[PDB]
Structures are given as C-alpha cells and as structure tokens.
Amino acid sequence: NPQPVDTSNITIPEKLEYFINKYAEHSHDKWSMDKLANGWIYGEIYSD
DSSP states (O other): OOOOOOOTTOOOOTTHHHHHHHHHHHHHHHHHHHHHHHTOOOOSSOOO
16 A cells, blocks of 8 residues: 655745755756757747
C-alpha cells in the first residue's frame, strides 16, 4: 500500500517562498534550454 505521509499537519515556512521562486526560475530555464535543444521554436504566437 503506497502511503505517502500526511501533509495537512505541516505548513510551508515563509523564508522558503523566495527559495521556491528561485528553483522555479531554475526549472523554467532548464525547460526552455532543453526544448530549444530538442527543436521547440520560440516566437510570439502559440502554435503547436
């Protein structure tokens, strides 16, 4: 039985919000670079 531990009994510290932001630019940057490497094109219109 996969039992992830309960999560409602904890709250995110406020000091970690800046941290969450930073790792999110980290992830966005790596996602941008690797999709550019794979061939995803950058532009001003959304065309899959």
